[PDB]
């Protein structure tokens, strides 16, 4: 009953069960400041039952530095009333309401979760006692400039169905013992990965029927391949085979009251370098609430006496605490830094904690992740200028400007820098929208000499609306970049955003040429693949521009910053590759559902798109036959045969001819090939070790007969015949009754499994119909589309995967799970996306101010399902050395290509230049993939290259002349130094 089209990317992070528990949960958001609107944004996008806003204060100027829904013409009104229609637009399924002041006990009764933001502590204590004693989930989140806190109180009895968010792992059973604590041994080359205390379940274990289908039993990890189970004394005798399935059991946790947790705090560390800070910041926020009782206002920005008042108050709060919470040492400077940025309201900090606080609300009414227990304190104190002595009398003083909440922390001069920044945003997806929103609130590119370049090739799909809040369901079929700019120009009219629709890569080097990266001050990535990340990384090294890299995956996030001449690049480190299924266990011996889904996706590409693309190239390119005959072995015959099939053999003319093909391919793929496989490998053949072949990762298949009444057999023919007719351009019907009536009249050719090659190829080149014989005929390839439930695409994969799963006795999967593996959908949620982008813009405050110390930067790593928060300083760029000169990744060789005379530098002058000016005996020279010079060159190759200029050599080997736009050239070297032996050296910028 839930809209899988809208929540597609989110149902892969919460699941249908936890989503249904969201549909029936009302949330109250109190305080619509910068932090309050951020929390409410992700909650509405998450899909709760209903959200209710609440606020008593007016929309002051100091609130526009982070609230992206308070326009400049709404100052003075009620924040909850004006931002209600804007928040109610994000999700057409969640009604949003506001309230105008009373926080009475009867009002809180109609809510399940209550969020308290920017509310005095004494006013929070009354709400905390009531909600906990009546079973109302409580979330308290406050942000004070660079600092911020987050608190949760989900009652003293909360059931957790999932405490880590990770999918259950599986393993295959080798041997199990009949001891009192039975010992299970997994297969070799496949670690179980389980933990002591986990619960597993057994299946397909023959010889111990009592162990199969049992309920969760505790396990103890005895090693990387063994673990123990329950009692196995009075069980049967084990034989062979089996599969272990990890199961997560629901466990209960308890939360203390707000008034009790404030006295007995349980902390969750955000920065492990700041381990002793959550205890100190717990006293600072209490003194900040009591500060509003002495002076009736937040402390003034910077200032000396107002900072000394918090130090005097914090010492009194420390003495009045319990003798286990009282700290023997008080950090005077940390509380004085808190008084300076107390009156500040920054968009990044609000976006970060607002993303976390919104995620805690998701855990409250779903029990899907481990919540924060119970306090979470975070500070971005490194964003301040390094030791710089700036006065508050000119800068931090409020100017009745929209940036008062941000200038009060940094200053007017640091605000003028942002207005003159030019940044390049690569992508307008989930991270792209959050960055444009923070750009508008921060103020970067909002001046006379500032610009924000947004480029993105994708159009707005229905699934994007769950996390990309700058888009609306009527913005479908529009460019993301153009639409996202129009949404930001309304949040801040001063911003200047240019929206391109160019796919960033090697083809668009003309648009983003050398002159483009010159006036840039930095680049911010928002990409969903690793190839574009590596491409943007190499260019930021060639042009020496800062890069802000970020990535998400479900509840996980990471942030890495690359500063020129300071840190290593994104490509310096390596990441583990994706799950690569061996071709053997993919084509013949599958064991999991992923092996059939990956097989069904390859069936779609090779059965519909691949033959049509070959026929079109055969009918368009006159040099197609010669091209295919040139490449590889047993590949010309595979492609030439496919052309003969699609042109004459398997060529349809009527819809009925497509139904017979779908029935013939069914018997060939799920019956004939299965009998052919069983012929080469009988169902009880032994291996070289005398062991049964069909054991463990190899499941014994069985042929499948065609039953016209079975819907799974019919669902396959309907989707196959339609996609087959679309390839040839024929009208396909959807009447499942007439097709089934027609299937009972189709004849299937007999099949008997079976136990110079160029001579067959010499006949095919002569038997192929000439393109002049049939003029007019053309086929149409079919691009795979996952998010369309009408093109029969997912209808084919599910039917193709589950039919193969029945052959190998594999449990099938629904079309929702099949869409995850075959479509390769990466799960994403709005709370994680907003959390990392807030951390990205924190380091952005350091880039625009120019930090040269590695201590100031922080690389972020998040996992909101644990919850985990870790930060580490970026690694300094690796320093290598050849003889007396040492070089860094950011260093280059500058070689002027053309000379005192108009002629170009030659290869000989190039080699001798490094021997006399740099003392480098060059022994290997290459530009890209082509090699130019090496010590092992043939004598003839060296003669015809020494006197030729460098551009003439590259164009000679690369078969492509250099374009007119090429202004410089990158060269790789492997030379010998003055020491004696081979040595690596920087690259060369060869300016033409």
């Amino acid at each position: 009953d839930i809209d899988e089209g809208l929540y597609s990317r989110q149902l892969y992070v919460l699941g249908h069960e936890a989503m249904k528990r969201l549909q029936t949960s009302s949330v109250l958001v109190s305080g619509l400041r910068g932090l309050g609107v951020e929390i409410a944004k992700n909650i509405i996008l998450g899909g709760v039952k209903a959200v209710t806003l609440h606020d008593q204060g007016t929309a002051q100027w100091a609130d526009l530095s982070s609230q992206f829904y308070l326009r400049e013409e709404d100052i003075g009104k009620n924040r909850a009333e004006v931002s209600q229609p804007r928040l109610a637009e994000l999700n057409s399924y969640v009604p949003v309401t506001a309230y105008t002041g009373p926080l009475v006990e009867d009002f809180l009764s109609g809510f399940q979760v209550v969020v308290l933001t920017n509310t005095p502590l004494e006013d929070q204590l009354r709400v905390g006692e009531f909600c906990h004693n009546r079973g109302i989930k409580l979330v308290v989140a406050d942000t004070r400039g660079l600092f911020g806190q987050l608190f949760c109180d989900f009652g003293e009895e909360m059931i957790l169905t999932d405490s880590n968010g990770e999918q259950p792992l599986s393993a295959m059973v080798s041997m199990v013992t009949k001891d009192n604590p039975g010992v299970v041994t997994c297969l070799d080359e496949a670690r179980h990965g389980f933990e002591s205390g986990d619960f597993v379940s057994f299946s397909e274990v023959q010889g111990m029927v009592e162990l199969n289908g049992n309920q969760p039993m505790e396990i103890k990890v005895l090693g990387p391949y063994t673990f123990s189970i329950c009692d196995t004394s009075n069980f049967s005798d084990y034989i062979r085979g089996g599969i272990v399935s990890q199961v997560k059991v629901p466990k209960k946790i308890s939360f203390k009251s707000l008034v009790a947790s404030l006295a007995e705090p349980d902390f969750v560390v955000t920065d492990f370098a700041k381990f002793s800070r959550p205890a100190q910041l717990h006293i600072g926020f209490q003194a900040l609430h009591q500060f509003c009782a002495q002076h009736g206002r937040p402390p003034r920005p910077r200032n000396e006496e107002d900072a000394a008042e918090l130090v005097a108050l914090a010492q009194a709060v420390n003495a009045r605490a319990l003798p286990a919470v009282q700290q023997n040492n008080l950090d005077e400077d940390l509380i004085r830094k808190l008084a300076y940025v107390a009156a500040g309201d920054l968009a990044p900090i609000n976006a970060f904690i607002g993303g976390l606080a919104a995620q805690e609300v998701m855990k409250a009414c779903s029990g899907k992740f481990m919540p924060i227990m119970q306090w979470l304190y975070f500070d971005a104190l490194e964003c301040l200028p390094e030791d710089k002595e700036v006065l508050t009398e000119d800068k931090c003083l409020q100017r009745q400007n929209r940036y008062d909440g941000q200038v009060a922390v940094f200053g007017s001069d640091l605000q003028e820098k942002l207005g003159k920044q030019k940044y390049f945003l690569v992508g307008a997806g989930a991270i792209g929208c959050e960055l444009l929103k923070n750009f508008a609130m921060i103020g970067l590119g909002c001046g006379e000499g500032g610009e924000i370049i947004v480029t993105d090739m994708d159009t707005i799909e229905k699934s994007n609306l769950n996390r990309q809040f700058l888009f609306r369901p009527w913005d479908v079929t529009k460019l993301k970049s153009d639409t996202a700019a129009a949404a930001v120009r309304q949040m801040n009219p001063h911003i200047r955003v240019t929206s391109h629709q160019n796919r960033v890569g090697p083809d668009t080097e003309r648009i983003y040429d050398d002159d483009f990266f010159q006036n840039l001050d930095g680049v911010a990535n928002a990409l969903d693949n690793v190839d574009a990340r590596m491409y943007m990384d190499r260019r930021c090294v060639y042009y020496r521009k800062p890069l802000l890299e970020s990535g998400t995956l479900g509840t996980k996030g990471n942030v890495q910053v690359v500063i020129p001449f300071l840190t290593e690049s994104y490509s310096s480190s390596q990441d583990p590759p994706e799950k690569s299924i061996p071709i053997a266990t993919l084509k013949n011996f599958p064991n999991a559902i992923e092996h059939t889904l990956q097989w069904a996706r390859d069936e779609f590409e090779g059965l519909f798109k691949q033959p049509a693309e070959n026929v079109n190239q055969y009918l368009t390119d006159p040099k197609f036959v010669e091209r295919t005959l040139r490449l590889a072995g047993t590949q010309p015959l595979e492609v030439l045969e496919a052309v003969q099939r699609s042109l004459v053999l398997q060529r349809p003319q009527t819809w009925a001819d497509c139904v017979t093909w779908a029935c013939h391919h069914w018997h060939t793929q799920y019956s004939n090939n299965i009998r052919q496989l069983l012929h080469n490998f009988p169902p009880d053949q032994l291996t070289s070790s005398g062991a049964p072949f069909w054991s463990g990762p190899k499941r014994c298949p069985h042929p499948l007969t065609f039953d016209v009444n079975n819907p799974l057999h019919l669902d396959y023919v309907m989707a196959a015949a339609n996609l087959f007719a679309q390839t040839y351009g024929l009208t396909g019907s959807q009447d499942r009754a007439a097709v089934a009536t027609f299937l009972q009249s189709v004849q299937v050719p007999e099949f008997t499994p079976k136990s110079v090659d160029d001579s067959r190829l010499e006949e095919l080149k002569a038997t192929l119909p000439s393109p002049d014989k049939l003029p007019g005929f053309k086929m149409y390839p079919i691009d795979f589309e996952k998010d369309d439930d009408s093109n029969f695409h997912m209808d084919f994969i599910v039917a193709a995967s589950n039919l193969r799963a029945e052959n190998y006795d594999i449990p099938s999967a629904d079309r929702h799970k099949s869409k995850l593996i075959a479509g390769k959908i990466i799960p994403a949620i709005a709370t994680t996306t907003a959390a990392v982008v807030g951390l990205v813009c924190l380091e952005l405050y350091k880039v625009v101010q120019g930090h040269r110390q590695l201590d100031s930067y922080k690389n972020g790593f998040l996992n909101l399902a644990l919850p985990f928060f870790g930060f580490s300083e970026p690694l300094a760029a690796p320093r290598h050395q050849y003889y007396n000169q040492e070089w860094t990744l950011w260093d280059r060789f500058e070689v002027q290509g053309l000379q005192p005379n108009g002629e170009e530098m030659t290869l000989k002058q190039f080699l001798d230049y490094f021997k006399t000016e740099h003392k480098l005996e060059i022994t290997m020279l290459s530009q890209g993939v082509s090699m130019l010079y090496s010590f092992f060159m043939p004598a003839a190759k060296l003669k015809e290259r020494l006197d030729q200029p460098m551009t003439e050599i590259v164009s000679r080997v690369s078969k492509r002349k250099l374009g007119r736009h090429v202004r410089a050239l990158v060269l790789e070297l492997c030379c010998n130094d003055e020491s004696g032996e081979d040595v690596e050296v920087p690259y060369v910028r060869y300016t033409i």
Binding site: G557, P576, A828
Partner: protein, 76 residues
Amino acid sequence: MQIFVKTLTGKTITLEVEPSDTIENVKAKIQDKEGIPPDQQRLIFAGKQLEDGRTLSDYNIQKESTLHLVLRLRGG
């Protein structure tokens, strides 16, 4: 001593090492229990990233200390 290594899956690993051991030897022990090459391990401790060639005493790692095996991600 006895150090802990926690991953992004909540999986906590127990190791038996000595303060004289190097970072390179620690990454070799992780591969013998989890199967991750040292080039794919990102270890964090006290706000610093563990680099090869260093020792456990350079980063000041006492007994009962926790390391974090993090990862970078692709979606966006």
